[PDB]
Amino acid sequence: PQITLWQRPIVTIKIGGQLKEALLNTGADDTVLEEVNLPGRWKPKLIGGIGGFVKVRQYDQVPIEICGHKVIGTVLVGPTPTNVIGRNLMTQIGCTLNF
Amino acid sequence: PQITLWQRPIVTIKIGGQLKEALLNTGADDTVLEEVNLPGRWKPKLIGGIGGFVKVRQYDQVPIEICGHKVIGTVLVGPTPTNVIGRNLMTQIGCTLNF
Amino acid sequence: ETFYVDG
């Protein structure tokens, strides 16, 4: 699709057998999602850094469907004010900024 | 333009007679820039909200050139870890997400 | 530095 930015670019995603919504966020390096139970291995990762750090679980090479595109990438799982699709997954779906 | 997202989408902008760099951030509603001295009227605005709020100066209808496109929009001025072009100005330049 | 934002 071509998505205009008058509203927040929220899309449907399929992850870990669940249907969720998340924000396509070009200002975010990584993808952070809450309330998902993913199978397989993980390691803790410290993110943010303003006021302290937030610890999340890093799962590598996670199959995820983003607005109909089945891709693979790292997903950080932890509490997040809004589910975020970061550049790491936007590259996978071939998402570009155009003007 | 077409900008891929393998790196952070940093572009050159001209604002208040200065040349700056800023991040094209589809996850941000508003544009926030630091170390710019804009002429004309402003009013305080509270932004953020995690851990407290940050107070910035809101300037409306500011002429700004973003990656060669001369547009007008609201610019918030205050300390920001990185200069951000938010959706409010991406709509003005006709910037879309495409995949 | 993931970013986003409101206010």
Q: What is the DSSP letter of B67?
A: T
Q: Which candidate from B28, B53, B54 shows the least CB-CB separation from C3?
A: B28
Which residues of chain A make contact with C2, given a CB cutoff of 8 A?
25, 27-30, 32, 47-48, 84, 86
The Cα B36–Cα A79 span in angstroms is 34
Tokens found for residue A68: 């109909």
Q: How was this structure determined?
A: X-ray
Domain of residue A19, residue span: 1-99
Any A CB within 8 A of B28 CB: yes
What domain count does chain A have? 1
Tokens found for residue B46: 């509270």
What's this structure's resolution in Å?
1.8
Which residues of chain A make contact with C1, given a CB cutoff of 8 A?
29, 49
| b/e A32-47 (16+ beta carbons within 10 angstroms → b) | bbbebebeeebeebeb
| CATH assignment of the domain containing B33 | 2.40.70.10
Count the alpha carbons within 13 Å of B36 in the hemisphere toward its beta carbon. Answer: 31
Backbone angles phi, psi at B76, to 5 degrees: -95, 135
Question: Considering only residues 28 to 87 of chain B, which have any Cβ-Cβ distance to chain C shorter than 8 Å?
Answer: 28-30, 32, 45-49, 53-54, 81-82, 84, 86
Closest residue by Cα to residue A61 from A80, A38, A84:
A38
The Cα B31–Cα B20 span in angstroms is 13
Residues 6+ apart with CB under 8 A from A59: A38, A40, A41, A42, A74, A75, A76, A77
CA distances from B41 to A96, B57, B62, B72 (A): 36, 9, 10, 15
B51 φ/ψ sector (left φ>0, alpha ψ -120 to 50, else beta): left
Q: How many residues does chain A have?
A: 99
User: With an 8 Å Cβ cutoff, are C6 and B25 in contact?
Assistant: no
Q: Which candidate from B23, B25, B47 shows the least CB-CB separation from C7?
A: B47
